[PDB]
Each structure stands twice: as structure tokens, then as C-alpha cells.
Amino acid sequence: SDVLELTDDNFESRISDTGSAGLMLVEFFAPWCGHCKRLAPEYEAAATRLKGIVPLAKVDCTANTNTCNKYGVSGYPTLKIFRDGEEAGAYDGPRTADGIVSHLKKQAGPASV
């Protein structure tokens, strides 16, 4: 696994590890059955594909509800973006590993692909 498994106990220290990647990506989810179980093995694969390019993380909204209601998660799976460890807005692509990598390639260097 390559996804960070952050919590309210330590999240506030790990978003500051950003610099070379410019940002951190995170998925808010829950332990209940749903599209989060179908997307988890794709989001794991994105973190392997982007390990030195875009940091990826996961957070349980049922266990970190105080962060997730302040962040306006309100449902799951819910992907968000934090430039230099501070809110840039939200993810904007397919719910697949290919979507995460494509959203990077489109700004990192789409020429000569």
C-alpha cells in the first residue's frame, strides 16, 4: 500500500510534508458498504503510480467527523486537494486510478505523450 492512513490524532502534522509535489490529495470515506469499497483498490493503485509525484491519503468520516463536517464532505467517497497543506478545493475527474493520474498528466506535461 502507498496511501497515507491519516487520523485526527496526526493529520495536522502530515499535510506539512508537502513541497516537491506542490500539494496533497485525500479521499474521505466510511467503513459501510458502498462505492468507497469499489474505489479503494483503484485509489491504492493511483498512490503507487504517483508515489514521487502526488501524495495520496484516506480518512474515515465516521471516525473523523469533526474534520469532515468542517470540510463539507457530507457523503462518500469524496476526494479533495490541499496545495502546500492548505485547501485548493476538490478533485475533478473519473472515480478511477486513471482519473487521478490523468488529472496530474494534464498539468505536469501533456505534450509528446
- Identify whether 36 is a catalytic site residue: yes
Q: What is the DSSP string of 1-58?
A: --SB---TTTHHHHGGG-SSSSEEEEEEE-SSSSHHHHHHHHHHHHHHHTTTT--EEE
Exposure string of 87-96, with b = 16+ CB inside 10 Å and e = fewer, is eeeebeeebe
1-113: CATH topology: Glutaredoxin (3.40.30)
Cross-strand partners of 24: 82
Q: How far apart are CA 74 and CA 6, in angstroms?
A: 19
> Of 5, 84, 90, which Cα lies nearest the Cα of 44?
5
For the chain, what are the domain ranges? 1-113
Catalytic pick among 1, 9, 32, 33:
33
- Elucidation technique: NMR
Catalytic pick among 3, 26, 36, 46:
36
